[PDB]
Amino acid sequence: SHCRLDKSNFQQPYITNRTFMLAKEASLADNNTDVRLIGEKLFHGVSMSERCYLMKQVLNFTLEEVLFPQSDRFQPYMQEVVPFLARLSNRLSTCHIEGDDLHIQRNVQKLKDTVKKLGESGEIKAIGELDLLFMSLRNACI
């Protein structure tokens, strides 16, 4: 199936506010001012029709290796945002692209590598960038 998310997923003020507030709080705990996770490099070579699928991979990675491990932290917003993002992941579940995703895998791997290079603060940074994740999912999938 084609990866996509109705725009209504990103137009509700309550959860959108919680998401941005969680990002702000985490960013205040992130001192890595030299690294950006969601940016040009992540999308390099990815065509518009594959962006949502790319974001699906970034989302699932962020859920499994960042948000879940940090799920009991950044209370109480974390506990409201995680279920929201997980539902989006579930909606995208198993959707795919009809083309080769080798370039997408490489771009995601670099993001994963960057988070590990940063260690714990890598996870903190990812949470601090939930605002960019939110906007990237919306922009690539609606």
Added chain:
Amino acid sequence: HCRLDKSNFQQPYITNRTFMLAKEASLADNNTDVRLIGEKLFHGVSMSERCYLMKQVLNFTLEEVLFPQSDRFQPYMQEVVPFLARLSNRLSTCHIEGDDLHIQRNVQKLKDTVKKLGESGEIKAIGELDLLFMSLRNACI
């Protein structure tokens, strides 16, 4: 430098109305069409430059989009614009250290997209006012 007091964003009513205004305008905008506010807007922009970046976007949107559409999208527009104008007023002349070229270039892209699309460009911009509001908050508080 650019910054805004937390109090300025502790407005649940206006937040909800901003999202309603964005939803309404979004109805007339093709969702799968090009976007305006996103990661690309922040390309090469440090965290300390974000509020200044959003200030540019906020002012462009107010003067080139909202004011011109100030009589449409009632009754949402009539409440949101005054609020956004106040914030613009608060950010008066606040700026950054040296060389904002990368910032202006990123903003130029958003501006070109809106202008090339004419009226539809304005509608698209209003449809993304929710992202503008949230981005401004996180970049300036």
